[PDB]
Design a binder for these strands. Structure first.
Ligand code: MG
Ligand code: MG
Ligand code: MG
Ligand code: MG
Ligand code: MG
Ligand code: MG
Ligand code: MG
Ligand code: MG
Ligand code: MG
Ligand code: MG
Ligand code: MG
Ligand code: MG
Ligand code: MG
Ligand code: MG
Ligand code: MG
Ligand code: MG
Ligand code: MG
Ligand code: MG
Ligand code: MG
Ligand code: MG
Ligand code: MG
Ligand code: MG
Ligand code: MG
Ligand code: MG
Ligand code: MG
Ligand code: MG
Ligand code: MG
Ligand code: MG
Ligand code: MG
Ligand code: MG
Ligand code: MG
Ligand code: MG
Ligand code: MG
Ligand code: MG
Ligand code: MG
Ligand code: MG
Ligand code: MG
Ligand code: MG
Ligand code: MG
Ligand code: MG
Ligand code: MG
Ligand code: MG
Ligand code: MG
Ligand code: MG
Ligand code: MG
Ligand code: MG
Ligand code: MG
Ligand code: MG
Ligand code: MG
Ligand code: MG
Ligand code: MG
Ligand code: MG
Ligand code: MG
Ligand code: MG
Ligand code: MG
Ligand code: MG
Ligand code: MG
Ligand code: MG
Ligand code: MG
Ligand code: MG
Ligand code: MG
Lengths: 98, 48, 177, 136, 48
RNA sequence: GUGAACAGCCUCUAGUUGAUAGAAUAAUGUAGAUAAGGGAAGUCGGCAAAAUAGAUCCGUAACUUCGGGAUAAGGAUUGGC
RNA sequence: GCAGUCAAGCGUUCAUAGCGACAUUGCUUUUUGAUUCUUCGAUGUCGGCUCUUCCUAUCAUACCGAAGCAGAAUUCGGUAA
RNA sequence: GAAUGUUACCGCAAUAGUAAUUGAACUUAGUACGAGAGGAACAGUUCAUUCGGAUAAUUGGUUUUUGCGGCUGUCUGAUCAGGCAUUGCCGCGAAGCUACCAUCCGCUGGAUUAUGGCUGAACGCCUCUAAGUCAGAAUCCAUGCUAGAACGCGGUGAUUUC
RNA sequence: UGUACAACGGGGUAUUGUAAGCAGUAGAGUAGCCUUGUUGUUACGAUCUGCUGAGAUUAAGCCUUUGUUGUCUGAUUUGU
């Protein structure tokens, strides 16, 4: 079971729900309701219809703490040396000086 | 009560939809326990 | 689906299989780069954090960082981009590409252990494989030993042994710059 | 359906009653197909027989090569438009009605099929599958 | 209870649901739960 | 006022607000509308209905009594500021 | 219009698998005639549309018997509306 | 719907009605049969046609939800907000209604017809028939399904004091 | 006289598509006064943006409710 999403509005389309349009050039559109589906046929542009995901994305509506930072990074520092040279005499010659 | 939709795999060897999901309508009837308050006993007669 | 897991600290890798829709499910709708805790996927991995780095679906088509989408699309690729090696200067090809968002269609998820769980994963944390090559350019030899331009590299250059039946040869790089 | 169709077809909404004209989808020379009958269809006083996706009709060519005109021949519906509903739950419709001219066996007169093809037809008619680009 | 012991295959199949729809029947339901609806929509001028 | 306009539609002056009434909204009607896909297969017959339409620009066949046919056909455009 | 009886013939052979001349016995009342009994102080024509029901001399569908039924196809017949 | 003491609840079942239809594909099987060309069927499986009874989760249609928005013309000094244009017009539109345009459901026993048989005399033989009997059809009777006799009926509750 | 009932109100569920108000270095631009501009200043401008997936409507045969206010003996008739 896959939840699809609305080509025009970007709403979740739970199973058997709204309608599916296969356009002239084998591009497949999915509407969750005759609303999105009329607006689509009307040649309306999703990015100008305010309630659409697409519109809100474009107009940066209510995203807030997705621009908030995080705490994601590693902590490594481990030697393996060089394959073929005996990784024994690679730490006792690894004593630096400054 | 009402109706809703179901999604389930189908077990039907031979069918084009064997082992595939189908969506199906269903009804739901509210069914609290029934309470037993009487017994009634019938006898057979040549009149029913 | 296969998980292809790397422990870049050790240089190790081993694959793991999973036949559990619910365990598998955890990776769904996540993207490349997003981190994933362990206990869900398996009790082996309790603790372990995985960074999702890519992977293939059936039909074998690779994922591609950046696309978003949980489907497959055909893109026009160039030089210096993943999933395409140009045959000819100025060549660009149109090519199918799998999206970056994980879904049940993937044959293999490519994970990369970012930090270690409460327990060891056999062929991974318990085995370690050394870098093939050593520093070749003069100052890289300096920094890989912290040396200051005084110590003279010539003897700090790494040396790899090799036997000729009853002769053992020793060959170093060739410093440069 | 029928002769030359290996497999069955789960019922799909009829969209093309007799008199429907559908786009001809192959490269046989024919530009359109006028439906005069539907195969294996039954009978009720006053009902038009009607085709659905993957049905074999009997048609004539209203527009196209003169060698293709003025005769009845078999053809197969490959795109519908009237929305119909698969067992997986979806109501889906194409953007045009269209079929490809064929022989009783179900073999295609032409060799390519322009545009998409519905699966339920693909599944039903091997040589229609062959000459398909995008199915569904 | 049925009056006969059907064998039908259709009868006998042992179904096992995968998903029960639970969005609003009072219109074009877009959401199973108020939780899901919160997820998708974000904070509203009411809310916290 | 709009508009080509003594058109339609709204308005001032003047004049009416008269036409049994109340409560419901079954069937069948009369009068007014709409319908997915197909598109005259309906019918004696496209009956009924639908479609078209203003203005500016472009473009306009047969044939002809040379006056026409002609808004032939076919197209684009049209608000606000 | 439909169905019989006799059986000379047809059917390579073979009357009657399937048919069937000359004759001849019938049934039917959606043919057409023949009649003129009812209605001329009126019982609204032809066809179509719609809708019910009925008959069987059965086209299909169920189960059968026969064949000049190898099979497949078909033909003849029965119980059947 | 009067009257059969009243009123209420639960039931019986006389009689009447009654319903399911047809096809294909797979498999059997390139099998049986056949020199060959060709070429079946029963059991099993998946679908379909015609019909019927419902239903409205989904999709579609309907729109006076005159619910939200848009538009023209005018009128209320402007604004806000509105009135009028026999529902002014347009896009969307819940709810209800609704469509093989949508979904779901349509039972299994007996007795028989034709016909093929058993045993078996008439007629020492022979015969499915005379006695007796087996098997048997989209038929028939029931099962099931709809009414429920307003002059068919049962079980049960409570039955008025100014 | 109570898990009562209703009318409101609240919350949910829906529908539409971002209200009025205010503000703005957004705006083809335009006026007016000078102290004639080293954003000169004061206001006007279809539309745009922000507060604002807002505002409106939402049982009339949607769901729910610890809130508010209210209501809770009129009439007729029946017996073996
Ligand atoms: Mg619609
Ligand atoms: Mg709708
Ligand atoms: Mg060098
Ligand atoms: Mg073409
Ligand atoms: Mg007719
Ligand atoms: Mg022509
Ligand atoms: Mg080919
Ligand atoms: Mg609803
Ligand atoms: Mg007067
Ligand atoms: Mg009058
Ligand atoms: Mg009245
Ligand atoms: Mg229509
Ligand atoms: Mg047309
Ligand atoms: Mg005609
Ligand atoms: Mg025509
Ligand atoms: Mg006709
Ligand atoms: Mg005529
Ligand atoms: Mg005629
Ligand atoms: Mg007319
Ligand atoms: Mg129209
Ligand atoms: Mg002309
Ligand atoms: Mg302009
Ligand atoms: Mg003779
Ligand atoms: Mg003979
Ligand atoms: Mg002879
Ligand atoms: Mg006759
Ligand atoms: Mg007379
Ligand atoms: Mg007479
Ligand atoms: Mg007369
Ligand atoms: Mg008379
Ligand atoms: Mg008269
Ligand atoms: Mg009369
Ligand atoms: Mg008979
Ligand atoms: Mg028989
Ligand atoms: Mg013979
Ligand atoms: Mg009958
Ligand atoms: Mg009879
Ligand atoms: Mg009868
Ligand atoms: Mg009395
Ligand atoms: Mg085979
Ligand atoms: Mg032979
Ligand atoms: Mg029938
Ligand atoms: Mg309005
Ligand atoms: Mg203002
Ligand atoms: Mg008027
Ligand atoms: Mg509706
Ligand atoms: Mg039906
Ligand atoms: Mg039944
Ligand atoms: Mg039964
Ligand atoms: Mg019986
Ligand atoms: Mg015997
Ligand atoms: Mg017998
Ligand atoms: Mg007898
Ligand atoms: Mg006898
Ligand atoms: Mg039967
Ligand atoms: Mg009674
Ligand atoms: Mg009684
Ligand atoms: Mg009150
Ligand atoms: Mg806003
Ligand atoms: Mg009502
Ligand atoms: Mg309150």
């Amino acid at each position: 079971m896959k939840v699809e999403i609305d080509s025009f509005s970007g709403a979740k389309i739970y199973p058997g729900r709204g309608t599916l349009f296969v356009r002239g050039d084998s591009k497949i559109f999915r509407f969750q309701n005759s609303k999105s589906a009329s607006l689509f046929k009307q040649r309306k542009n999703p990015r100008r219809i305010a309630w659409t995901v697409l519109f809100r994305k474009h107009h940066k509506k209510g995203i807030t703490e997705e621009v908030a930072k995080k705490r994601s990074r590693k902590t490594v520092k481990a030697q393996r040396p060089i394959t073929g040279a005996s990784l024994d005499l690679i730490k006792e010659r690894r004593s630096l000086k400054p | 009560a009402g109706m809703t939709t179901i999604v389930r795999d189908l077990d039907r060897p031979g069918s084009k939809f064997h082992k595939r999901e189908v969506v199906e309508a269903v009804t739901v009837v509210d069914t609290p326990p029934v309470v037993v308050v009487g017994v009634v006993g019938y006898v057979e007669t040549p009149r029913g | 689906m296969k998980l292809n897991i790397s422990y870049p600290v050790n240089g190790s890798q081993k694959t793991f299989e999973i036949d559990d829709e619910h365990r598998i499910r955890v990776f769904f709708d996540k993207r490349i780069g997003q981190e994933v805790d362990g206990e869900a996927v398996g009790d082996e991995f309790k603790g372990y954090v995985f960074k999702i780095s890519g992977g293939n679906d059936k039909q074998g088509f690779p994922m591609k960082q950046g696309v978003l989408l949980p489907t497959r699309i055909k893109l026009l690729l160039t030089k210096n981009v993943s999933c395409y090696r140009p045959r000819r200067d100025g060549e660009r090809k149109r090519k199918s590409v799998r999206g970056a968002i994980v879904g049940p269609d993937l044959a293999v998820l490519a994970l990369v252990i970012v930090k270690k769980g409460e327990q060891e994963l056999e062929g991974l944390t318990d085995t370690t494989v050394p870098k093939r090559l050593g520093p070749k350019r003069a100052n890289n030899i300096r920094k890989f030993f912290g040396l200051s331009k005084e110590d003279d590299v010539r003897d700090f250059v790494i040396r790899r042994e090799v036997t000729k039946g009853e002769k053992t040869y020793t060959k170093a790089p060739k410093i440069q710059r | 359906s029928g002769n030359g169709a290996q497999g069955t077809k789960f019922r799909i909404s009829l969209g093309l009653p007799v008199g429907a004209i559908m786009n001809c989808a192959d490269n046989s020379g024919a530009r359109n197909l006028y439906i005069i009958a539907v195969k294996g269809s039954g009978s009720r006083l006053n009902r038009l027989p009607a085709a659905s996706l993957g049905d074999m009709v009997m048609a004539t060519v209203k527009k196209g090569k003169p060698e293709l005109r003025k005769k009845v021949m078999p053809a197969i519906v490959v795109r519908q438009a009237k929305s119909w509903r698969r067992r997986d739950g979806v109501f889906l419709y194409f953007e045009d009605n269209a079929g490809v001219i064929a022989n009783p066996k179900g073999e295609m007169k032409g060799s390519a099929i322009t545009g998409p093809v519905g699966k339920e037809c693909a599944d039903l008619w091997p040589r229609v599958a062959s000459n398909s680009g995008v199915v569904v | 209870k049925s009056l006969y012991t059907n064998t039908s295959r259709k009868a006998l199949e042992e179904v096992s649901l995968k998903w029960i729809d639970t969005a609003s029947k009072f219109g074009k339901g877009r959401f199973q739960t108020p939780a899901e609806k919160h997820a998708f929509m974000g904070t509203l001028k009411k809310d916290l």
